[PDB]
Amino acid sequence: SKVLILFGSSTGNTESIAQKLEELVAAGGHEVTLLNAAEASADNLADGYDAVLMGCSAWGMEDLELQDDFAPLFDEMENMGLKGKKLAAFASGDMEYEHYCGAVPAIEEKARGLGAEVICEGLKIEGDASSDPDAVSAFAEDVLKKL
Numbered sequence: 001s002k003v004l005i006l007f008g009s010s011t012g013n014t015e016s017i018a019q020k021l022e023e024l025v026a027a028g029g030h031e032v033t034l035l036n037a038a039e040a041s042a043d044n045l046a047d048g049y050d051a052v053l054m055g056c057s058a059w060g061m062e063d064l065e066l067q068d069d070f071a072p073l074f075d076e077m078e079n080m081g082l083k084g085k086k087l088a089a090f091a092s093g094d095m096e097y098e099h100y101c102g103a104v105p106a107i108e109e110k111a112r113g114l115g116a117e118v119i120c121e122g123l124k125i126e127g128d129a130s131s132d133p134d135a136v137s138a139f140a141e142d143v144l145k146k147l
């Protein structure tokens, strides 16, 4: 299984999560690509991958507003070629705000709708990967059993 990990991150918190996930999924024996949303193109992005792990921060309090680099890709999710592919979502957020890790349910709902198989419940963490290393590790463990 060739995994793509796609992240949108403004201060580096979801990026640290993406990086820890790359390390752990690769360690499990998978070919893994790390891609920042800033340099990604939605059109047929999932071609050649068996699983896509996507995640980003939310920025709109009362409304859901996704991370700037990720939001155009989210809007063009229909073009990625996700039908039949496995998917899991992750996010860094802050519980003081409304829509805590709101990108996770939003990506899961949109992905299901396009024929992707969402492999497990998305990771929701406050702060960066070293603030909650065990939740990151358990989620990676969940994806590895499903790949």
Ligand SMILES: Cc1cc2nc3c(=O)[nH]c(=O)nc-3n(C[C@H](O)[C@H](O)[C@H](O)COP(=O)(O)O)c2cc1C
Binding pocket: 008, 009, 010, 011, 012, 013, 014, 015, 056, 057, 058, 059, 060, 061, 062, 067, 092, 093, 094, 095, 097, 098, 099, 100, 101, 102, 126, 127
């Ligand atoms: C104006 C503003 C709005 C925010 N809105 C949300 C939000 O709706 N949900 C959430 O979980 N966090 C929200 N946050 C918190 C950030 O998502 C949090 O700092 C996150 O860890 C940043 O992750 P990143 O560095 O990967 O972009 C907001 C922050 C700011 C400044």
